[PDB]
Design a protein around this nucleic acid. Structure first.
Lengths: 183, 62, 373, 109
RNA sequence: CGUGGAGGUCAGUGACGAAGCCUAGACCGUAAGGUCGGGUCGAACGGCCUCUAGUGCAGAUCUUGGUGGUAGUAGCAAAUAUUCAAAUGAGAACUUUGAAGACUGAAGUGGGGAAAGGUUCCACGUCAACAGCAGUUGGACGUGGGUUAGUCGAUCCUAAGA
């Protein structure tokens, strides 16, 4: 099984998948790149805003034949769309994840999602029906969306090293000749 | 709750079409249980299945 | 809920039903005899004739009481005659019969209801030959061996249960039964149930169980309270894992809870007819069209079957109905139980001889003797 | 508060036509009735009636003669709703023409 | 020089981890390359001296299978029209029931036969693939039932024909 890059402690983290549903994988990718910075509850209240069509995630990658939108001066790119049906699938990954950390003894108020992974769901026996010779495969790709929460900053401690430097004999006598004047 | 069968079954009774009959949305707990012709002809004299007003053709102008 | 939760009239209805149940059961026991004996009398006894007689009797007697009364009375449970191994619910259709044979152990179970109040009784006894050929041969001689052991065990269980009333738990009954049964070396049939009867309701969720570890968990502990009625059933086996070998059901009850719209006309008609019945339990014997109708209804679970179960060489049963209530005397209120079944339930203790007896001396058994006495 | 006040507003479903097909007037009405209810009462989820739909579809798609007289009755909603409980309920009545009528306050009498 | 394979030998190596793949790890050589470490993997492996020739690889409109940019693209216009309410459901513009508004106007999407097809009709249940949006319904899937004839046909007979 395993997961992505362990940027934080996996012992204190929760996650969930949403495969074999409906909505594709790159469609929920754009909103997964803009969620990297929110604080959990900033995404829960965002779900209702989509159904009312108020905020649209900037589809910066998908630009070719992608219509603009009035909701573009929020961040920058005027080409954005609303993950409508994705909302019912995003909540599937959430909510339950908050219950997974409940049994561990944690709280879902500081553990914000920063490392979300999404792949490509498998295919089946699917063939097209076009102009005879133009028949290859009807196979497509659902989803493999999975998000992993991450705790906030707790005691960073940069810890400045001693910084070992090759000092010379004419250097230790130079510094000592400066401390007898200024210092 | 497909009841297209019960309506089509009414055409094999006497000669009533599938648009002259009149049911009721109130007694939905009776029609669902009686999914056959066993309780259809008895639901006429009591006051359940009627026809009432039907758009027709007159020859009074003639 | 039910206003007039308890009424004097209700008590009367049970008592009257009980009186009839008692009389009918006595009558059947007198009739039970060996086939050969019955032959001398120019009569025949089989599993069917008794059953027919007893059911008819209940109808007739009920007819006398509250007859034509704005209500309904009749047969709560059809008369069932088990035999040695066969545990219960054997009420044969006309279409294999069972002939009584001297020395057979027989259990008769029947029920009567007045206006829905039910009185159920059961009894066990051994079968003997005609008095005239035998003159008091059978009275002089006792029953011994396993038959005696099981019968005594069952009876004692019945006596213990009668003692064990409001403020008691069902569990205590179950525990006592195991101790008493074990005394012979008998075992109560696993997972049997006793009911806490209501008007028009034989089944009752509240119950006393005879149970493996598995059913212990699903069983529900409960405390008996005043104004509650029970039909205590005690089944014991010399062997106690009953099984459904292959026997035609014959006894069924209508389940009010489930409803289905049945496709066949015959089945619909049967359903209507059954609803009319009055008691939950009727026998099919009440013939041809019924067989067909039963099939669809049972499948749907409209009807619930009472199967016949069996223990080959190795069952005894005593069932009585009791009314529990709160009595106040000397400014003290204590629960007391009244036993409706009466004479029907009783058995002559002198008849049975058993090598084993409950033994209070060992730590395990002590207290039971006192309880019985 | 739930308020619950029966009022009779003035609205005609026959003249409001501009660049819309005469077979697709109904989807426009969906964004009109709910809009008219939101403008006055203030709600989105509006449950109509079988007799209410007959008021619009009288004798054709545009069966509305002249100025009708609709009666919107704002009530309360429960059964675990998601939107506003103060929905709207139009009560269609018999009316030839609305002349000199602006609003009628209907109480419990 | 490398790979596959046979014979002989260091009476080799081998769960203290063979061989194969990746490696912004290193050494030697002008060019063909090999060895070591880590990760993955857990069963028989490699060098030298010989023999064998269907061993190595950018293109022959080369063969077969699979995967991109284009591309979250073009297309989704023959046939007037959707909307409201109720039941069920986590979920409904579209299936069921009722009402209103309409299309086709027995030369129609009607109602009866032959040919092809032989369980695609009827009942119940289900929604993971397919059903190019949706769809609890269905011609998708699973579990059953119906096949009753002296009489309308066929079989028998005849022309063409074999």
């Amino acid at each position: 099984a395993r997961y992505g890059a362990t940027s934080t402690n996996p012992a204190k983290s929760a996650s969930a998948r949403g495969s074999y549903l409906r909505v594709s994988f790159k469609n929920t990718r754009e909103t997964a790149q803009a969620i990297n910075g929110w604080e959990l509850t900033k995404a829960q209240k965002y779900l209702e805003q989509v159904l009312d069509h108020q905020r649209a995630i900037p589809f910066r990658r998908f630009n070719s034949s992608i219509g603009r939108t009035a909701q573009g001066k929020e961040f920058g790119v005027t080409k954005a769309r609303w993950p409508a049906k994705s909302v019912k699938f995003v909540q599937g990954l959430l909510q339950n994840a908050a219950a997974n950390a409940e049994a561990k003894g944690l709280d879902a108020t500081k553990l914000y999602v920063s490392h979300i992974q999404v792949n490509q769901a498998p295919k089946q026996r699917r063939r097209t029906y076009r102009a005879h010779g133009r028949i290859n495969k009807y196979e497509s790709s659902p989803s493999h969306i999975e998000l992993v929460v991450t705790e906030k900053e707790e005691a960073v401690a940069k810890a400045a090293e001693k910084k070992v430097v090759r000092l010379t004999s004419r250097q230790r006598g130079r510094i000592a000749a400066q401390k007898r004047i200024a210092a | 709750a497909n009841l297209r069968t019960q309506k089509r079954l009414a055409a094999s009774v006497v000669g009533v079409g599938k648009r002259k009959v009149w049911l009721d949305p109130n007694e939905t707990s009776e029609i669902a249980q009686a999914n056959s012709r066993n309780a259809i002809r008895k639901l006429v004299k009591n006051g359940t299945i009627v026809k009432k007003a039907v758009t027709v053709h007159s020859k009074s102008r003639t | 809920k039910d206003k007039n939760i308890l009424q004097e009239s209700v008590l009367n209805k049970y008592r009257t039903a009980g009186q009839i149940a008692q009389t009918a059961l006595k009558y059947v026991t007198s009739l039970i005899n060996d086939s050969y004996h019955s032959k001398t009398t120019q009569r025949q006894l089989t599993v069917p004739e008794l059953c027919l007689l007893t059911d008819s009797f209940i109808l007739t007697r009920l007819e006398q009481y509250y007859k034509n009364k704005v209500n309904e009375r009749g047969i709560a449970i059809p008369t069932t005659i088990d035999i040695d191994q066969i545990s219960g619910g054997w009420c044969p259709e006309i279409d294999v019969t069972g002939t009584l044979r001297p020395g057979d152990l027989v259990k008769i179970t029947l029920g009567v209801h007045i206006d829905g109040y039910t009185s159920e009784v059961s009894h066990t006894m051994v079968i003997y030959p005609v008095d005239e050929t035998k003159p008091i041969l059978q009275p002089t001689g006792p029953l011994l061996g396993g038959k005696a052991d099981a019968v005594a065990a069952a009876h004692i269980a019945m006596e213990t249960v009668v003692a064990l009333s409001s403020g008691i738990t069902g569990q205590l009954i179950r525990t006592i039964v195991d101790t008493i049964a074990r005394s012979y070396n008998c075992g109560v049939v696993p997972g049997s149930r006793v009911r806490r009867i209501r008007r028009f309701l034989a089944g009752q969720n509240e119950g006393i169980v005879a149970f493996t570890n598995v059913s212990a968990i699903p069983s529900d502990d409960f405390v008996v309270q005043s104004g509650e009625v029970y039909l205590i059933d005690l089944k014991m086996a010399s062997l106690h894992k009953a099984g459904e070998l292959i026997a035609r059901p014959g006894a069924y009850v209508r389940d009010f809870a489930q409803t289905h719209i049945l496709k066949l006309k015959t089945s619909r008609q049967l359903l209507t007819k059954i609803d009319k019945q009055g008691v939950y339990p009727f026998k099919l014997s009440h013939l041809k069209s019924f067989r067909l109708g039963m099939s669809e209804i049972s499948n749907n679970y409209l009807c619930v079957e009472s199967p016949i179960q069996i223990a080959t060489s190795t069952v005894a049963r005593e069932c009585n109905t009791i009314v529990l209530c709160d009595s106040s005397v000397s400014t003290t209120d204590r629960p007391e139980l009244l036993r409706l079944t009466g004479g029907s339930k009783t058995c002559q203790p002198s008849w049975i001889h058993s090598q084993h007896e409950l033994n209070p001396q060992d730590s395990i058994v002590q207290g039971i003797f006192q309880l019985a006495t | 508060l739930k308020d619950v006040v029966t009022r009779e507003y003035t609205i005609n479903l026959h003249k409001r036509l501009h660049g819309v097909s005469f077979k697709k007037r109904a989807p426009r009405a969906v964004k009109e009735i709910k809009k008219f209810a939101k403008l006055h009462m203030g709600t989105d989820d509006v449950r109509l009636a079988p007799e209410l739909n007959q008021a619009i579809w009288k004798r054709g798609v545009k069966g509305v003669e002249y100025r009708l007289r609709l009666r919107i009755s704002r009530k309360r909603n429960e059964e675990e709703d998601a939107k506003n409980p103060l929905f709207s309920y139009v009560e269609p009545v018999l009316v030839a023409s609305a002349k000199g009528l602006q609003t009628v306050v209907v109480e419990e009498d």
